[PDB]
Design a protein around this nucleic acid. Structure first.
Length: 178
DNA sequence: TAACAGTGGCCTTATTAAATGACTTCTCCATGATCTAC
């Protein structure tokens, strides 16, 4: 298999393309084929540069840790509700929590979920393709989810500045930092 | 040897709390089709 199937499954040494390649069983190859359906994609905004002066290009991939097929399926189909402007974040943790923002908290059930956020970013301006730069593991509990839900409810939402044939989505730095 | 040990009234009035411009520049790609040599 190659990096398009397994993210990060790069061939380090191009002169050994035949041998030094990640190998998987056919069933796991089919699973890796179906990977992109579940994982969700967020855009990372660097606050050092102004939003207007350059549009975002960094991509965050939220890969959840599966506890049950039904649970993750329901979570993804529920995440289908979110507006597109919510997927623009200014921190990896914001995206990780946003994946689980719609989750219903049960007081009688011990809530625990985990996910990984993968950052894809061009090394230079003329880079042809994005490169995996960092992987962040996020573990969320009931208190973290409740606090993030309150923060989302009470803090200002993402503004949608609309200019000529471009929709510049201005993120909330306070929400991302918190 | 004594009796005093200051009685008053004020404790800043204005005014201005920055003016500019810069907010990185390069490069290091990965992978498969094809060319080619043994």
């Amino acid at each position: 298999i190659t990096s398009w199937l397994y993210l990060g499954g790069i061939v380090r040494h191009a002169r050994t393309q035949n041998t030094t390649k990640l190998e998987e069983k056919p069933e796991y190859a089919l699973a890796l084929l179906f990977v992109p359906v579940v994982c969700h994609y967020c855009l990372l905004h660097i606050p050092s540069e102004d939003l207007k002066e350059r549009k975002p290009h960094r991509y965050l991939v939220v890969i959840p840790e599966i506890k049950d097929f039904e649970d993750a399926s329901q979570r993804r189909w529920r995440l289908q509700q979110l507006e597109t402007k919510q997927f623009h974040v200014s921190s990896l943790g914001e995206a990780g929590l946003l994946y689980y923002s719609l989750d219903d908290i049960q007081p009688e059930v011990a809530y625990y979920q985990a996910c990984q956020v993968w950052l894809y970013e061009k090394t230079n301006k003329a880079s042809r393709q994005r490169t995996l730069m960092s992987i962040e593991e996020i573990k969320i509990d009931k208190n973290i989810l409740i606090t993030y839900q309150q923060v989302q409810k009470y803090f200002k939402t993402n503004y949608q500045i609309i200019k000529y044939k471009q929709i510049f989505i201005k993120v909330n730095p306070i929400r991302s930092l918190i």
